[PDB]
Amino acid sequence: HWGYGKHNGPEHWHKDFPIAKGERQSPVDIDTHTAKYDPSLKPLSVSYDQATSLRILNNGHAFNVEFDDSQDKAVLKGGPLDGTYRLIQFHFHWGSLDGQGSEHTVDKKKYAAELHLVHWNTKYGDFGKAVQQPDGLAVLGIFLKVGSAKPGLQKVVDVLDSIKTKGKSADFTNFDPRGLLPESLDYWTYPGSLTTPPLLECVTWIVLKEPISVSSEQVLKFRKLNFNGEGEPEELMVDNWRPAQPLKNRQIKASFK
Ligand SMILES: CCCc1c(F)c(F)c(S(N)(=O)=O)c(F)c1F
Ligand SMILES: OC[C@H]1O[C@@H](O)[C@H](O)[C@@H](O)[C@@H]1O
Numbered sequence: 545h546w547g548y549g550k551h552n553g554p555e556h557w558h559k560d561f562p563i564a565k566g567e568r569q570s571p572v573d574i575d576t577h578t579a580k581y582d583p584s585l586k587p588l589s590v591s592y593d594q595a596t597s598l599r600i601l602n603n604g605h606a607f608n609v610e611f612d613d614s615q616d617k618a619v620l621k622g623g624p625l626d627g628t629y630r631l632i633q634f635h636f637h638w639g640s641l642d643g644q645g646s647e648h649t650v651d652k653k654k655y656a657a658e659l660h661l662v663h664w665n666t667k668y669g670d671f672g673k674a675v676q677q678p679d680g681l682a683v684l685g686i687f688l689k690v691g692s693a694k695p696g697l698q699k700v701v702d703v704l705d706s707i708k709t710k711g712k713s714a715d716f717t718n719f720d721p722r723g724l725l726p727e728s729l730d731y732w733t734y735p736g737s738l739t740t741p742p743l744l745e746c747v748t749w750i751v752l753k754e755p756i757s758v759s760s761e762q763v764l765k766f767r768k769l770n771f772n773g774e775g776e777p778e779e780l781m782v783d784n785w786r787p788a789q790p791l792k793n794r795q796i797k798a799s800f801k
């Protein structure tokens with residue numbers, strides 16, 4: 545199956561997922577000079593006060609922190625979005641070294657990692673139906689740089705030892721995703737896709753301009769996870785990022801002047 549190595553990574557995905565060469569693939573490089581302020585964007589509303597985290601899972605590609613999405617407990621609205629999008633999970637992409645790891649780039653600069661908060665459009669009733677729609681998903685992307693520690697990330701870091709290998713999960717209740725946000729909600733937005741197979745072109749991307757800072761020790765613990773399952777030879781879970789894809793007939797809009 546697909547992965548991030550030389551024999552099953554991003555340059556191979558198109559053979560089983562031909563949309564990999566499609567017209568609105570993600571991630572992309574964000575050329576900050578070409579992005580244009582869009583006065584039609586409404587204020588962005590991140591409403592995570594009632595979020596209910598449930599579980600953390602190593603899926604062999606990354607780790608997902610999963611939420612209860614049976615009600616509008618944690619929703620994203622506003623900005624470029626029409627209606628209400630419900631948080632289902634978050635996960636990260638990261639590198640083997642601090643100089644790489646993000647999927648989106650900013651004037652070609654790669655960050656050490658990138659956080660994705662995945663939301664589905666409630667007008668479609670379930671995530672599965674949402675990924676049949678051009679406006680089915682909204683992903684809030686947040687860059688990570690290495691500097692001071694992020695206190696709100698530490699609970700995630702400390703549980704990773706219990707989900708080292710593919711297929712392991714652990715209870716992860718009462719986690720507040722608000723502790724992963726930067727101060728500013730200035731953002732860039734464009735239409736794109738899932739960055740993992742099946743690469744479906746369903747996503748409104750909202751990428752925050754301000755990175756969060758995490759400590760070297762925190763990201764080093766990400767890099768101790770394993771792509772492999774228990775009992776199998778160790779393949780460190782690093783460099784689980786897709787590189788930037790062609791922008792094609794798209795414009796990136798900025799929320800800020
Ligand atoms: C495959 C369905 C689950 C899933 C998403 F919905 C999604 F949006 C992303 S991403 N990197 O584009 O944010 C994923 F990596 C991912 F695995
Ligand atoms: O025709 C002019 C229009 O061109 C579009 O490509 C831009 O997104 C708009 O901001 C601009 O007003």
Ligand SMILES: [Zn+2]
Pocket residue numbers: 635636637660739
């Ligand atoms: Zn992602």
